[PDB]
Amino acid sequence: GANSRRLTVDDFEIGRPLGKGKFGNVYLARLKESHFIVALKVLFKSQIEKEGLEHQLRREIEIQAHLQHPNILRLYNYFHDARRVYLILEYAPRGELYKELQKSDKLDEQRTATIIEELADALTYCHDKKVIHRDIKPENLLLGFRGEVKIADFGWSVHTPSLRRKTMCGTLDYLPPEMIEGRTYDEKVDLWCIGVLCYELLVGYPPFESASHSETYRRILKVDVRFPLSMPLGARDLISRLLRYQPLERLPLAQILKHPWVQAHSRRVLPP
């Protein structure tokens, strides 16, 4: 139709590399004519094909076509040539949160509470659209122009009308108990991961970290969370309400947003 557009590499001017990501590099770029600034992520097809994750790329693009949120990194569109798929992405001018954690070790309460509010808002929107994210962790988080968080990558995510799936997803330190047990799970896996993320942002390491894989599994399943002497009570409370073995006991997103510690410390800004 009228809005079926032709997009190719010649529509873009490359500015600079932004870093290596999964299956390829990200570049700052702009549209030659409009000068609209984007991040162009260059995915190597052979790498995706070899790993057999074609279906994940499809999930990203389908989710991106149906969801938009100020704290979700927007995929404006995509195209491909013989060897590469190009994601035309929202540019995140303050870059990777995980680089800004290399700086400080941990984030202060204001920064953390802000991110937590933003993510609970973003995930409310995702869950309402029947999307479970399943990969909330610092390495997935970018920072907008005024530091507003952006969830980067939906590759581990899925649209699920029934909100019930079984695929094992995400990274070791963030696995909920029901995934380790190989059981069917719902959207409340995301609630668990918010808990883990809150801990890691404030402490600088995740709560079940261990030298070994099996020990991590053991600490996750037992919900062996021990809060360092540095952590304020409000954050210990919030995290304790999210990291519950039973999914149905986990603090709902609506209540994360209302949590006194979130309300006290969040300094969230929204773009126009």
Partner: protein, 66 residues
């Protein structure tokens, strides 16, 4: 995509362009158009079962946004 970094892509020029874009968001449908459905066969030049076999993942009840 390995080029010398042009002046627009750094320092005050970049910041000021980012500021402009931040406060003057364009019509994104007009700029980028519809996100075309993925044809995995076409993209990877291969037929695999997963390319054709979908779960409920494929059944959207909410509208495409752009």
């Amino acid at each position: 995509p390995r080029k010398p970094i042009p002046t627009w892509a750094r320092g005050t020029p970049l910041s000021q362009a980012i500021i402009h874009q931040y406060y003057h968001p364009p019509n994104l449908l007009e700029l980028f158009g519809t996100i075309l459905p993925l044809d995995l066969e076409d993209i990877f030049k291969k037929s695999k079962p997963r390319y054709h076999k979908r779960t409920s993942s494929a059944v959207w009840n909410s509208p495409p946004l752009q």
